[PDB]
Design brief:
The complex is a heterononamer, with 3 copies of chain A (105 residues), 3 copies of chain D (448 residues) and 3 copies of chain G (117 residues).
Chain A: E1 4-7, E2 10-11, E3 19-25, E4 33-38, E5 45-49, E6 53-54, E7 62-67, E8 70-75, E9 84-90, E10 97-98, E11 102-104
Parallel strand pairs in A: 2-11
Antiparallel strand pairs in A: 1-3, 3-8, 4-5, 4-9, 5-6, 7-8, 9-10, 9-11
Chain D: H1 4-8, E1 12-34, H2 49-72, E2 75-77, E3 80-83, H3 84-87, E4 89-91, H4 92-111, H5 115-120, E5 125-129, E6 135-140, H6 143-149, H7 159-181, E7 193-194, H8 195-198, H9 206-212, H10 220-225, E8 230-237, E9 242-265, E10 268-270, E11 273-277, E12 282-286, E13 289-293, E14 299-300, E15 304-307, E16 312-313, H11 317-323, E17 332-334, E18 343-346, E19 349-352, E20 359-361, E21 377-379, E22 386-389, E23 392-395, H12 405-408, E24 415-416, H13 420-447
Parallel strand pairs in D: 1-6, 1-15, 17-24
Antiparallel strand pairs in D: 1-9, 2-3, 5-6, 7-8, 8-9, 9-12, 10-11, 11-17, 12-13, 13-16, 14-15, 18-19, 19-21, 20-22, 22-23
Helix pairs in contact in D: 2-7
Chain G: E1 3-7, E2 18-25, E3 34-39, E4 46-51, E5 57-59, E6 67-72, E7 77-82, E8 91-99, E9 103-109, E10 113-115
Antiparallel strand pairs in G: 1-2, 2-7, 3-4, 3-8, 4-5, 6-7, 8-9, 8-10
The chains are: A mainly beta (105), D alpha+beta (448), G mainly beta (117).
The structure holds a molecule of 2 linked components (NAG-NAG).
Amino acid sequence: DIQMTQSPASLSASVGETVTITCRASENIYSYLAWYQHKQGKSPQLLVYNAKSLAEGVPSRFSGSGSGTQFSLKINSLQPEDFGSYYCQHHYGTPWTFGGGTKLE
Amino acid sequence: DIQMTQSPASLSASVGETVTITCRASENIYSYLAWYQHKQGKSPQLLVYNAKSLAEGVPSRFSGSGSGTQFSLKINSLQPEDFGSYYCQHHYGTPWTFGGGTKLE
Amino acid sequence: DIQMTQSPASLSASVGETVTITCRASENIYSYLAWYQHKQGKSPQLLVYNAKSLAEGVPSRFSGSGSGTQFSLKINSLQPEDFGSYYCQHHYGTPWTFGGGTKLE
Amino acid sequence: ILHYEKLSKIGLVKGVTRKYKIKSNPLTKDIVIKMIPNVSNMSQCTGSVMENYKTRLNGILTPIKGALEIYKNNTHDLGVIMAGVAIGIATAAQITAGVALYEAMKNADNINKLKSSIESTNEAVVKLQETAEKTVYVLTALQDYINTNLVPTIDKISCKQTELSLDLALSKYLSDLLFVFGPNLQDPVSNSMTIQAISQAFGGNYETLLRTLGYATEDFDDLLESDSITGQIIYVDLSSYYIIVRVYFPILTEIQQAYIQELLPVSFNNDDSEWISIVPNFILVRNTLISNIEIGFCLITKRSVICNQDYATPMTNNMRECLTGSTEKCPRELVVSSHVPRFALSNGVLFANCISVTCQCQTTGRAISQSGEQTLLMIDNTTCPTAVLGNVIISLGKYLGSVNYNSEGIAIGPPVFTDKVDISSQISSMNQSLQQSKDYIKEAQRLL
Amino acid sequence: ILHYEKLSKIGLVKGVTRKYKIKSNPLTKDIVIKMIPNVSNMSQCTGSVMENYKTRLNGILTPIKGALEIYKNNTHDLGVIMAGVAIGIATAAQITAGVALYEAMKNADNINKLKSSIESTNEAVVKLQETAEKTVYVLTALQDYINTNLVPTIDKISCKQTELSLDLALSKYLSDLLFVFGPNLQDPVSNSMTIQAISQAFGGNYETLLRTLGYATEDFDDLLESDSITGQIIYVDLSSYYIIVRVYFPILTEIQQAYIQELLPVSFNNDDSEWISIVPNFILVRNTLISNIEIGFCLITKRSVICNQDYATPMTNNMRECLTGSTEKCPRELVVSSHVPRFALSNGVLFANCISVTCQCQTTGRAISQSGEQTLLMIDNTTCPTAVLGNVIISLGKYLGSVNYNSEGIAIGPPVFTDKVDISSQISSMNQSLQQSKDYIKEAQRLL
Amino acid sequence: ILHYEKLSKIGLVKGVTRKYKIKSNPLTKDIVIKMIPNVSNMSQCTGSVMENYKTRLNGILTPIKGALEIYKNNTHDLGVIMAGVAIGIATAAQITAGVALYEAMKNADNINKLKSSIESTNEAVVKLQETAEKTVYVLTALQDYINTNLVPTIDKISCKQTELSLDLALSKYLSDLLFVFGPNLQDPVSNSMTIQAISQAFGGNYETLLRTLGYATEDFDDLLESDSITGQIIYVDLSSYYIIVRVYFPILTEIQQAYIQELLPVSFNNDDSEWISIVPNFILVRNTLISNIEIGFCLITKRSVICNQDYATPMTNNMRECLTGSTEKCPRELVVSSHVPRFALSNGVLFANCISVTCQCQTTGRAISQSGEQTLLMIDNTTCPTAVLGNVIISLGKYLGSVNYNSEGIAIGPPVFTDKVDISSQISSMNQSLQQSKDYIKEAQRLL
Amino acid sequence: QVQLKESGPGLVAPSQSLSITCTVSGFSLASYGVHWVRQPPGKGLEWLGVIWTGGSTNYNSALMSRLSINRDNSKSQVFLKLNSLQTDDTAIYYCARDRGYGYGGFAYWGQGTLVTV
Amino acid sequence: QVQLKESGPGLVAPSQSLSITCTVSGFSLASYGVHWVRQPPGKGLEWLGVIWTGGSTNYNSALMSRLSINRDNSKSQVFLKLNSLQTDDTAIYYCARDRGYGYGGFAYWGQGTLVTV
Amino acid sequence: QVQLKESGPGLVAPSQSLSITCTVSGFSLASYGVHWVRQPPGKGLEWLGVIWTGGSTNYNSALMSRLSINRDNSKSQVFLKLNSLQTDDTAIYYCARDRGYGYGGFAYWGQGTLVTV
Ligand SMILES: *[C@@H]1O[C@H](CO)[C@@H](O[C@@H]2O[C@H](CO)[C@@H](O)[C@H](O)[C@H]2NC(C)=O)[C@H](O)[C@H]1NC(C)=O
């Protein structure tokens, strides 16, 4: 299978600050990477797909980029509602896999 | 048909300043968006096509980006010659349509 | 054949500074442009291909962009090891060609 | 006109009656087919491929232009007069086609005024307006392939890979083109070339070609399968690599006094074996004449037989007498195969060889039996309203012929063998018997 | 049963013996073939193309649905009873197929409960679960083309160019579809339609269709080439543009008492010229009966002949006597071609016409000669262990027939001409000789 | 050699004279065709597709390798000696091909030294240099498809969609591959397999295959349409899924004393109806012998007839006498069709049945009439310099035969029926007349 | 070089038709499409309709019942027609060339012809 | 609108099987695939397996010997099954829809069902 | 791993030919192309010519009349030849591998061989 490493494990940032999450793949997954925002008690929300495109309904403060093995998610103005566990997923080969996730306070 | 909203209706900026124009589509038009610079008494000039590529002969101070429903045009150093009415056009489905336009002084 | 112009001929920059090299094609070569770092006594190293993608093993301080006729290479934090002659190559039509090169001290 | 009652008794059950129709009086339209793709927007990724293509293609088209020039150079306005001496040798079809070719040139000369628009065409299909009243369409080979798979792939695949894909697309095109426009096309003059063959010049996409030309819809699909819609090559341009084709759209007309009757073969009993009568399955009747037809070259539908020419052929007097009731002259072949039709349904009447197929009556619970003096049994309303053959239960109607059909009987003709080898063998063995008879009579004449 | 020794003497060398096998007792599965692609994710770049497509396609499918309705509307539960009066005219094949069609409807009605899943299908191949126990597959025409060449090309090519490519893909599809599901399909009821033809509805990709259905592998490939695997159109949906096809998978069974013997034709000497015997190359023997076969419609492999029906045909008494040793009745054609088989190998024994082919013995250095009283020479262990014909050196075994094979000789039959024109000529010239004999005997009868 | 003047009088107008040419003395080149695509750069998006493909393909190629092994394992250096006992049964064609196969192995063994380069090939066409002097080409199935439609679509379509497209491309490939390399290929040894069939292994792209091999251009296109260019499968690799094919490139040579004469059939008047003579349209003359030919298997061009073997066949004595002037023995069929050639042009001379086709003279304004004692009218310089048939005006030359052509007349032969059913009927009815004559003479012999 | 030049009437009455001819050079009409756009006195640019490289046409919804486009491939001309004019049809009418295979981006425009109603 | 709703057992013993049914609406199972993902108490999201639009399936390596997925195209349901449970299989199990033609990005998720072992 | 190693003559007289052999390993010549580039004493990098994966070749215009490239797929070698040398042909000659299906980016280079004229 294809493993993924996501870091930092935990983040602390204030409202209005720029927040970034880094994720790297053990293999080449081209542009096949998705980002999710997961709050406890709720199902995960899709934020970004194909390493850059926002899911419909996702605020434009979210953006991202990446290719092959190095990818990132950025928030250009952190909101109180952005607290939660962020997940990095590749959807290139099979199986699809998720990283450990980043907990943002 | 597919409608487009372009804003602000009117802009005021000094020479050398960064100027941006925002345009959104009522539907998903992928990368199919063009920008024009139109002076009165003259035919419109093409600046940008497919939401990012400059037309041959267009100064590199012009650039742009966008996807699906949210697009923008940017001037990285406004010149005296950049006065005029700017237009946002989609060329995805049929008919092709233009927005109201932005008047930049 | 297709000619290429690369400039400045020679650069001087300190460690940690941002360094850029500009290259333009006499014709439209789409995204078909590669950048190399060449030290004397050694074979050239590939840095960037298709005007933006890093070669495997190349440090992420390197990046680039461009299209058609206007392209550039950027170093976001110059290192002592980045001294050398940089080359711009197009690989669109045939023959493939290189520019004169930039000597970075 | 056919004695259907005596025929059904020998395994030839009256089947479907169909109208006889033949293509005539066509309308014409000219279409331009360009065999060379427009690669202007990938001109850096063609290498020498287009140069090799043009040379190879010229070697295919030149012999066609030459064949057409023989007629064109020798045909003049009088009212069209042909130099029979210069043509030297020709068939009637070529001669009349030679005139059609000449007359067609007069419009080809108008089409050629758009030569630069034809060359410039970069879409698979372009409608060109000559004078508004006059419209000509241009179809371009592989243009769609290039516009979707090579041009938009400029930074998807390498330039050399793009070149290789172009070369292969062109080579595959020629590989198929050669089956129609190659050496086999010894005669591009005769207007008998089916449109499905011409369309190979456009990838075999004849549906696009025909829709492009509009056509008439009265019976369009029948015209195509019967090969009634054909074209003629009018002009070949060896510098631009395109041809002008005249497409003929005939109207199928009904022959007021002609129809084709299908008979349905049914194995029947004779002596202690199964036999099948060898009589034409499709019989053509015109006025009062019973004749044959090469229906194998025609389209058969529920209501009519559609032919792209008249395929009527002669019938012998012995077969004609067979068909009109002299069944002692109807030839029969032995059935040895386990798979033969053993029954048929006609107008609600069931005819079956109840010796070889198990027949039972659904309404009485009794079996249906056949004697050795009977060929087929006719089963209807009067004997068994619902009859069973094998595992099929059939509700029947009434027979409108003799009520004594199953009692009267029928004369049976001589045995035959239809196999090609058997035909040669039978002719030879008859010659041995014939020579013996010849010697016997010659001896008698010498003695007397 | 065949007199192989006398036959080899006249150019008919015993060849390979093969088993006779025929398809029977098929298993059935239903598959759904949707002829209209799903363009939901390029809906802005279709224009009026899909509207024109639906209309054109309806004009192809409607006549099929109608033909099926004739049987469906007239077939009821009794145990299946057909309204023979309403059907009016039918062949045995249609009648039994009409029942199969009716029975098949009962499952088509289950498949149709997934009509919305069939319409929603956007993959070329979808496995739909009806009840877990019941599974039906849906195949969609051009879906792979669209998913790879039009949908992902949204910002690669223009929207209008995408529309044009869709229109051409659809038109090309119909151009090929029409050769199978067009006017030529006068009978969609009979279950005799080969699966390679049905598959044209899915681009001609019959390998995908068959793998999708699983099938049995005992002799799958032989079943396909022999056209034993066929389908029947059970249901046509003219609103959704899909059909339900029942695919039949028969098992080839061996006939315990039947085999086909191949003979190998060899030119032989007679008088001062080459001759070739005209005897069936493939002879069918069943129990004690020697008969013919239309093997041209069967698959020939190393061990067996695979037929999709029984193709056995009658043989004349003169040919049967030829085959059992009466070689004076075996017909022969003159060989004038420079390219004829002049030798054959059978069980290590070499038979050659050493007058027309140069024969030399490898082990002795001497030439192998043939007299004018001999047809072919039999060369084996006893005369020349290793013989040379032309440039080929063959190590031989032993002949198990008469040791005097080359000394005893054989009777030779009459000359024949097999050419179609020659057949008509020979019949006619014999009639002139026959009429002369008739007149001569009639004169003798009047005199006496 | 043919009596053209008497023949034209009975509807057989001298047509085009062509040279007789046959393929001989071929040059050979070996090419490698890999049936399995290289998917190394999409290895994460193949699933189990390649595993299923390899298994299915092995089931196609294994029977070919086996058939070749039978000859290879039994052929040794002496000068090539074959184990006739081990082969057991073979035809002459197989035997000589078995040697060609064996000799070819010696180069296949050199090609196989590049096995790793063959496996590594990722382009549709690769030129491999063995020793500079020796070059072998490798063609790879579906490689162009993959390089342009799957590899560059990695972030255009999903990975699973890419897998599905690969599976379908492979399945479609096999669907077509099976028509050539499937169960129908009972004999992969004989070197008679046309190159257009072999090329199916490379998508049917025979034009690429042939250009790749260079070939000779003297008459390349005629060689292809006549099926003179063929190949032989020399080696099958079931681990790498490629085959080595030897492609034969023969030279067409002219036969110094042989030509084929085409006659042009023209309907002619007799009694009160139209008749057409049934005489071979293409007559082969070699030295002083008039014979037939199965020209239906040859390519016909303006100057020559190109055959891939000798197709000459026997002619009867009655037909030969017909052709040399004994027209009382030339058979004729009744014309009942409304569409028959009613005229022909030969060397500027017009021959027409002016009873069935309206004939008028352009230079005099008078009609051209024909009596009931005449068959066709010969129209030339002396009677009407420019004649009109229907709507075609033809300028004529002069007839170089008898000036009394239209006055002398001709003998007319017996009626025939060429229909297959009519042939069986005619043979049978003649046997009834023959048996009556036999009984009549036997009675006379008993009385005397 | 590439040029497009519009020529037509100035003042046209209401309920009369409008016919504007675009004469072109530097390119073939068999290679490129031609689009019509207008500029009303106080409005933005309005796309009216297109005649594609293939000779087929499309129109916006507002003018679909009044607007027609045609071509002449012998004289290198494109024709814009309105069957019945309103006073709000006063505008400058422009002829523009599209980009290659039906791509947008009107790199080339004509001069513009003013129609008064 | 689009919905996915998981329903299944709560407490299931070790060595017993698990069967969770996902009922869906707003879309066809012949158009979209369905993926199963779980969230263990102190772990990240784990992709378990998929049933594709085409009805075929794939699984990760860890559960390949225990995990099976099936479908019902008449009742609009997708079935997740584990043949034998361990105590570390305690997790919230989710049903998610993929994007069009097998693309990633789980825009639509169900509610999640908690399984205790 | 991947390697390319050039071997050839040092000092070659004017009007003599040059023959440099590139021995390669780690990849097949049936999968990748090989390009030749040189570095003259005071000039930039000059692309000379290529032998493609397919075995076909291309050359720049300046050396098209003098430069030839060949291959050996048995010994894993690529051959660079110049029919007649000039003193300005003094340069370090390099053998480089291209990227997959004819894409640019010389990720892999040999060592370079210095030719003096
Ligand atoms: C008789 O027929 C011959 C042709 O067979 C005619 O002769 C030709 O006349 C043309 C006149 O333009 C010359 O160019 C040809 O060279 C002539 N050919 C030959 C073989 O001589 C002749 O003119 C005809 N005569 C009449 C009275 O019609």
